[PDB]
């Protein structure tokens with residue numbers, strides 16, 4: 001095999017209105033808060049303009065309050081770009097409940113590629129809607145004497 | 147504990163010489179070892195209802211013909227008869243191995259699969275980013291199962307497995323980092339992969355209701371003397387290079403936990419009586435002082451010393467617990483003195499000790 | 512379902528209801544047949560345990 | 570099999586009966602029999618000894634399905 005690189009352009013994710021758009025670069029996060037959402041990102045090859053498809057292009061959500069995480073996959077059409085549209089009413093089963101603040105990572109990797117990039121594009125806010133432990137100590141409430 | 151005699155099934159006899167360290171330690175503890183090929187038409191682990199092998203070890207990926215009496219139902223009946231079964235598959239699983247896994251609630255994957263990760267892999271991979279370096283951060287963290295010392299980054303190559311969330315008993319030991327997805331290598335991804343998140347367990351364990359320890363590990367090679375002696379350095383630029391892998395200590399801990407050596411408990415004679423008496427009188431009366439006593443032994447090197455018992459809870463239950471108290475450790479016996487409630491009927495003293503990595507003990511009088 | 516109980520009548524026949532069983536064959540997931548009398552008048556079933564390997568056993 | 574014993578009878582060639590009494594020697598609860606005619610040196614006597622042992626055949630599988638054999 002021969003080594004290859006990875007580059008992200010355009011970006012400019014936008015909050016969906018039942019539609020403003022904002023853009024950011026690769027090094028840093030996005031200022032502000034976006035509540036749903038479809039982040040767009042054009043993955044091109046570095047050093048020579050070309051269109052590649054990394055083997056792994058999952059998009060990750062981490063919840064700080066509970067510690068749970070949820071991962072999705074962005075599948076391309078024939079537009080040379082991806083799309084991750086959040087229905088905010090669909091995928092009720094995947095998100096059992098909504099948390100205020102979600103941290104959005106972009107995990108991307110390949111065997112041929114030389115460096116996998118994973119940084120939080122922006123913070124996301126989503127408002128769509130024991131077995132072996134000491135059990136609670138129970139006492140008995142005696143009847144009051146007459 | 148159990149008996150020392152065990153049976154070892156092999157993919158090929160070469161495993162005797164390449165897994166030398168693990169087998170030598172196992173024999174050093176006294177366990178008698180018999181090696182047989184997984185395709186032998188002569189082996190049998192039961193004869194006239196005897197279970198003539200106490201422990202079973204399966205180091206044979208890529209098998210579909212177990213032998214004379216060994217089937218998936220025979221291994222299931224062996225696990226129902228108190229056996230301790232350790233399996234290890236690596237990218238060559240095979241249909242009966244996957245079926246056996248499905249019989250314990252731990253689903254394997256397709257034959258060609260492998261747990262892949264591109265953030266934490268070591269420089270000794272030389273391939274399609276498949277030699278995973280699982281950190282000791284994401285780990286079950288129970289000193290009975292995994293040991294009581296600090297470890298180093300452990301590394302393995304194999305297939306990923308997921309747990310069925312319907313099982314209350316299944317436990318996950320060494321789940322992979324949030325960068326592993328466990329899909330086909332060298333093939334594009336279309337579906338949703340199998341356990342893409344941090345729920346790619348990679349080393350599972352099952353504790354049956356009759357206290358039968360079963361450890362389904364991926365990565366047969368994880369027990370190979372090549373991984374026991376190789377330094378680890380993640381390919382992320384400039385990661386720390388440890389001298390000792392820290393795989394050997396983990397392996398010995400797992401072996402001592404599945405062959406009933408590190409965590410085992412036993413319930414001795416119980417005794418309950420009126421306060422101020424010596425024998426249990428039939429048909430206690432309402433609001434009568436009652437004393438309860440029970441002994442538990444732990445098998446530390448076979449000594450069966452008294453258990454520590456920080457939090458053991460007695461339940462006085464009719465259909466739902468009327469009383470629930472702690473058992474104060476006093477003179478080797480766990481004795482509590484309490485007054486029976488106003489409600490009459492038949493009742494049940496109940497002790498339940500479900501602790502992670504400890505034998506589940508249950509007693510109701 | 513497969514016990515003849517009459518002369519000119521199909522096998523799965525019930526005398527008291529004079530009918531034909533709807534489900535001829537089924538399996539008891541949570542019960543073992545402990546005993547059954549000579550004329551199938553009293554049937555005793557032993558309730559089963561939880562599944563050892565912790566399976567569903569619906 | 571000294572404890573799982575039920576009966577020990579001793580007869581003689583033809584139709585006959587004999588008497589045995591329990592004895593102790595200084596141990597397997599040896600018995601002694603009193604012959605009808607004492608035998609001189611060089612004689613020969615045929616004595617039939619019949620013993621019955623109870624609870625000595627143990628079932629080896631110890632658990633048999635409704636469609637198996639002992």
Ligand SMILES: *[C@@H]1O[C@H](CO)[C@@H](O[C@@H]2O[C@H](CO)[C@@H](O[C@@H]3O[C@H](CO[C@H]4O[C@H](CO[C@H]5O[C@H](CO)[C@@H](O)[C@H](O)[C@@H]5O)[C@@H](O)[C@H](O)[C@@H]4O)[C@@H](O)[C@H](O[C@H]4O[C@H](CO)[C@@H](O)[C@H](O)[C@@H]4O[C@H]4O[C@H](CO)[C@@H](O)[C@H](O)[C@@H]4O[C@H]4O[C@H](CO)[C@@H](O)[C@H](O)[C@@H]4O)[C@@H]3O)[C@H](O)[C@H]2NC(C)=O)[C@H](O)[C@H]1NC(C)=O
Pocket residue numbers: 138139140141466467468
């Ligand atoms: C004829 O036959 C009938 C059936 O065979 C008999 O009936 C049974 O009778 C018993 C006793 O009366 C009933 O039990 C009680 O139900 C009460 C109402 O039910 C709740 O149901 C929900 C619970 O559901 C599940 O919840 C968890 C989920 O994991 C599960 O673990 C649990 O097992 C259950 O399956 C609940 O969500 C609802 O909100 C209802 O509350 C219930 O209040 C009773 O609970 C008591 O008692 C039990 C033990 O009896 C304790 O373990 C509880 O902690 C709770 O204890 C409180 O009361 C005790 C005495 O009353 C005190 O000692 C405790 O300290 C505690 O006190 C708190 O609350 C008091 C007020 O209630 C306060 O005064 C205190 O200060 C404390 O704050 C109990 O569960 C059965 O439901 C009932 N069966 C049926 C089918 O109805 C009937 O008796 C027979 N006839 C005769 C004449 O005998």
